[PDB]
Design a protein around this ligand. Structure first.
Ligand SMILES: [Zn+2]
Length: 44
């Protein structure tokens, strides 16, 4: 039991890149990688 959610950052497992909030760090880690979806698709 505790009220604060403080630590070595602003959000818990939220993506500080886009803001995607998750339940566990494992969910944010496997996501933060998806951000690498630029090379593939592109435009002329
Ligand atoms: Zn993200």
């Amino acid at each position: 039991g505790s009220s604060g959610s403080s630590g070595t950052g602003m959000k818990p497992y939220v993506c500080n890149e886009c803001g995607k909030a998750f339940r566990s760090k494992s969910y944010l880690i496997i996501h933060t990688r998806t951000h690498t979806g630029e090379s593939g698709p592109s435009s002329g």
